[model samples]
Target: SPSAQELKEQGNRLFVGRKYPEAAACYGRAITRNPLVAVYYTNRALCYLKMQQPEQALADCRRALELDGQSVKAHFFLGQCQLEMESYDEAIANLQRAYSLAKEQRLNFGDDIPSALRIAKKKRWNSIEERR
Candidate 1:
């Protein structure tokens, strides 16, 4: 049996190739073997998001966080899933957590955190305007 790390690596390759379903399958298998691995759930959640299944993605992201609360990727992806579902407040909260984690870890997520925060800010402004 392949180790969880090996499966995650394969899933990453598949994800980079835009093969979401296959990547999800690999992550699923890895999770089955090692349910405590935060990266597996985070990666699978990303694949679910790519498949346009926000609910499933959200569940996976939540599970990832439950397993490892410090998972920046899980927080970031959860925010993305919430954003797609139009849960702006939830998205903003998750995104904020992700940004904090990234900064604490000195991690680089490229433009992802900034982009999500920008969109969430705009959405919140629009929602506030509508409420007014």
Candidate 2:
């Protein structure tokens, strides 16, 4: 049996190849072996995001955060899922939090978080205006 890290490496390769389902499966197996790895859930959430399964991605992101609350990538992915679900306020909040941590974390996702927060802020503003 391969170690969890080995499975994660395989998952990363498949994910890079755009084989989302296979990557998710690899991450799933890794999680089964060692559920303590928040990164495994984060990786699986990314696969769900690639699969356009935002709800599943959201769930995985939440799970990852439950295990590791300070994970910038997990928060970023969760914010993305909320954006897709049209929960603009939550998305903005999470994205904002992620952005503040981006530079310190040196996260690649920093480039994407700003756009998500922009969209969410716009939608939230429009929603508030509509209620006026």
Candidate 3:
């Protein structure tokens, strides 16, 4: 049997190729074998998001955070899921936390954090405007 790490690696490769369904399958298998791995949940959550399945992604993100509360990717992706679900306040909070953590860790997520924050804020503003 392939180890959980091997399955996760396979999922990573598929994810890089934009094969989200296949990637998510591999990640799910890995998670089944080793549910303690926060990265596995985060990886699968990303695949879910890429496939436009934010509901599943939200579940995975929450699981990832439960395993590892300090996971930057979990916070970032959870924010994304919240945004998709139109929970603007929660999205902004998670995104801001992701940004702060990324800066403190010196992990370059390119412009992902900033760009996502901008979009979330803009959407929240638009939603408020429409209510008036």
Q: Which candidate leads the pack in TM-score?
A: 3
* Per-candidate clashes, comma-separated: 0, 0, 0
The CA lDDT of each predicted structure is 0.92, 0.90, 0.96
Writing each residue's lDDT as its tens digit, candidate 2 over 2-55 gives 999999999999999999999999999999999989999999998999899999
Cα lDDT tens digits, model 1, 23-113, are 9999998998889888899889989999999999999998988989899999999999998888899999999999999999999989889
Ranking by TM-score: 3, 1, 2
**Against the true structure, candidate 3 has what lDDT?**
0.96
lDDT, ranked from best to worst: 3, 1, 2
The local lDDT score (0 to 100) that residue 32 gets in candidate 3 is 92
Give the winner by lDDT: 1 or 3: 3
Segments in model 3 whose C-alpha atoms lie over 4 Å from true places? none
Q: Which ten residues in a row have the lowest lDDT in candidate 1?
A: 30-39
Colliding pairs, model 3: none
- Scanning candidate 2 in windows of ten residues, the lowest lDDT window is 103-112
